Amino acid sequence: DKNELVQKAKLAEQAERYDDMAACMKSVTEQGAELSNEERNLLSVAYKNVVGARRSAWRVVSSIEQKTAAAAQQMAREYREKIETELRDICNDVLSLLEKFLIPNASQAESKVFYLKMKGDYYRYLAEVAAGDDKKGIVDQSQQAYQEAFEISAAAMQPTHPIRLGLALNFSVFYYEILNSPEKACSLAKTAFDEAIAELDTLSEESYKDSTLIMQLLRDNLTLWTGGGGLRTVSLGAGA
Amino acid sequence: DKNELVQKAKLAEQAERYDDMAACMKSVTEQGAELSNEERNLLSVAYKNVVGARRSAWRVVSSIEQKTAAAAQQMAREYREKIETELRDICNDVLSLLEKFLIPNASQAESKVFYLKMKGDYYRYLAEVAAGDDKKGIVDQSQQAYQEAFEISAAAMQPTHPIRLGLALNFSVFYYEILNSPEKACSLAKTAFDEAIAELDTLSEESYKDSTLIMQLLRDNLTLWTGGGGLRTVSLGAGA
Numbered sequence: 001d002k003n004e005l006v007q008k009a010k011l012a013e014q015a016e017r018y019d020d021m022a023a024c025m026k027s028v029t030e031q032g033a034e035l036s037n038e039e040r041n042l043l044s045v046a047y048k049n050v051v052g053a054r055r056s057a058w059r060v061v062s063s064i065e066q067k068t069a070a071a072a073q074q075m076a077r078e079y080r081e082k083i084e085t086e087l088r089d090i091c092n093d094v095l096s097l098l099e100k101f102l103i104p105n106a107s108q109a110e111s112k113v114f115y116l117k118m119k120g121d122y123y124r125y126l127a128e129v130a131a132g133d134d135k136k137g138i139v140d141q142s143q144q145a146y147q148e149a150f151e152i153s154a155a156a157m158q159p160t161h162p163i164r165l166g167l168a169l170n171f172s173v174f175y176y177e178i179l180n181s182p183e184k185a186c187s188l189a190k191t192a193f194d195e196a197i198a199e200l201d202t203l204s205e206e207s208y209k210d211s212t213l214i215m216q217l218l219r220d221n222l223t224l225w226t227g228g229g230g231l232r233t234v235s236l237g238a239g240a
Numbered sequence: 241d242k243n244e245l246v247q248k249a250k251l252a253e254q255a256e257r258y259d260d261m262a263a264c265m266k267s268v269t270e271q272g273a274e275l276s277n278e279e280r281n282l283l284s285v286a287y288k289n290v291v292g293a294r295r296s297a298w299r300v301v302s303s304i305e306q307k308t309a310a311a312a313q314q315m316a317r318e319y320r321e322k323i324e325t326e327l328r329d330i331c332n333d334v335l336s337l338l339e340k341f342l343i344p345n346a347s348q349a350e351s352k353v354f355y356l357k358m359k360g361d362y363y364r365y366l367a368e369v370a371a372g373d374d375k376k377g378i379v380d381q382s383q384q385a386y387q388e389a390f391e392i393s394a395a396a397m398q399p400t401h402p403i404r405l406g407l408a409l410n411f412s413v414f415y416y417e418i419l420n421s422p423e424k425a426c427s428l429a430k431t432a433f434d435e436a437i438a439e440l441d442t443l444s445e446e447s448y449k450d451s452t453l454i455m456q457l458l459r460d461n462l463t464l465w466t467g468g469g470g471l472r473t474v475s476l477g478a479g480a
Contacts, residue, residue: 004315011319014304015297057255064254075244079251 002028009042018049029097034105040114047094051125054087058129084129094122109156110163116149117167120174127178139178146171159195160203162210168192169218176225186225193218242268249282258289269337274345280354287334291365294327298369324369334362349396350403356389357407360414367418379418386411399435400443402450408432409458416465426465433458 009024025043029035035043061083065076098119106112123142130138149167157164168189176185193215203211223229249264265283269275275283301323305316338359346352363382370378389407397404408429416425433455443451463469 004311007312007315008319011301011304011315015300015319015323017297057257060255061251064251071244072247075247075251079248079255083255 002031002033006039006042009046013042013045018046018053021046022050026093026097029101032101032105034107034111035102040111043097044114044118047090051087051090051094051122054083054090055125055128058083058087087129088126091122091126095119098122109152113149113153113156113163113167116145116152117163117170120146120149121170124170124174124178127174142174142178146174158202159192159199160207160211162207162214165192165196165211165214165218169214169221172218172221176221182225186222189218189222193222242271242273246279246282249286253282253285258286258293261286262290266333266337269341272341272345274347274351275342280351283337284354284358287330291327291330291334291362294323294330295365295368298323298327327369328366331362331366335359338362349392353389353393353396353403353407356385356392357403357410360386360389361410364410364414364418367414382414382418386414398442399432399439400447400451402447402454405432405436405451405454405458409454409461412458412461416461422465426462429458429462433462 005024005028009021009028012018012021012024021042025039025046028039029043058080061076061080065073065080068076098115102115103112103119106115120142123138123145126138127135127142146167150171153161153164153167159165169192172185172189172192175181175188179185196211196215223231245264245268249261249268252258252261252264261282265279265286268279269283298320301316301320305313305320308316338355342355343352343359346355360382363378363385366378367375367382386407390411393401393404393407399405409432412425412429412432415421415428419425436451436455463471
């Protein structure tokens with residue numbers, strides 16, 4: 001049952017068998033009860049590890065398929081298509097769970113934001129390997145989910161809330177990588193980052209560890225996207 | 241065919257999909273032709289990654305099953321038994337390939353030593369999780385394979401040969417971990433290590449990188465097995 005599957009998943013996770021962990025939490029979700037915060041995390045972790053495995057493998061084999069003979073074309077296509085199928089299966093599972101169980105059962109504006117972000121992410125993972133007619137609609141589906149989550153969080157969370165900030169991060173990545181719109185991508189991330197700094201007081205010890213990491217990630221992305229970020233060497237003489 | 245499967249495995253390996261890599265090389269072996277030195281390595285790598293995954297997972301779940309409730313006993317046993325089954329399947333595959341294809345086809349005393357070491361290893365991996373009646377015979381099968389390899393290498397290789405030294409390493413581990421005979425384990429490793437130093441001239445640039453690593457591993461094990469190894473602080477004043 002619920003408690004057995006969760007303790008099962010905690011074993012799976014400790015043992016780094018994330019496919020087992022995802023299988024556990026898939027079943028948990030399908031009981032139809034709203035996940036806990038522990039259980040939200042467990043599911044979330046499980047599936048990032050699973051899809052992530054496929055996504056890194058895909059990029060390796062794509063880059064090899066780029067970096068090439070016709071013998072070596074034949075092999076790499078047939079393999080990337082294999083990995084692509086695995087990957088889409090994984091994404092379609094999560095996207096299903098989100099549609100049927102997670103987003104409908106989300107009773108708090110936070111949990112809803114997390115699950116809309118998750119949809120946005122998994123549609124973006126599809127967009128990474130989407131081709132032809134399908135890309136159009138899949139990019140919409142990601143943006144549609146991210147934008148829904150974005151506007152909810154804008155109303156519901158403090159600028160320094162790790163979920164809001166994490167959302168801004170992945171949304172700016174969608175805009176940058178998937179949509180190829182850096183004007184938009186950098187403004188999204190910068191405005192979030194600025195707004196968080198403007199309300200550092202509103203940060204509690206509770207989430208000081210996590211908010212300051214996501215801010216560094218936002219800033220990291222930003223300087224990367226804007227060439228060298230306009231940077232020059234600085235001392236504790238920066239302000240006037 | 242052979243060349244397609246090998247280039248297939250090189251993709252699999254680059255993409256860290258070692259189950260695919262093992263599957264590739266399993267088929268290669270089963271063509272019935274003696275593997276190359278490239279192909280020996282590919283198979284060997286593929287399966288260490290595969291069994292290694294299971295072995296680390298096993299030890300994690302065993303230690304959790306130790307560190308515990310009866311609820312938590314029920315879950316951990318049923319899971320360790322799952323992993324144990326996976327693991328034995330993997331070992332039985334390799335052990336089969338070694339028996340039917342690799343050791344029979346080994347035409348050079350080196351390749352034979354490598355494949356006898358490999359048998360010794362995979363029987364030792366079984367010994368790690370063996371229980372009851374079976375352990376007896378499985379420990380014999382490991383020692384029988386290691387000893388065969390040992391005596392061949394003693395005649396056929398220089399004391400500084402990485403294969404001889406690597407064999408001494410894993411044999412001393414069998415004696416230590418699986419057999420629980422440290423007198424024997426430390427003498428095996430020390431005598432190998434001493435004998436290599438005694439003939440450092442016989443070391444070529446070809447294998448200088450690898451022989452000096454295995455020697456450090458032998459020595460590492462040795463100081464660990466003999467308490468603190470009799471060590472005190474030393475300077476370039478050590479010799480007389």
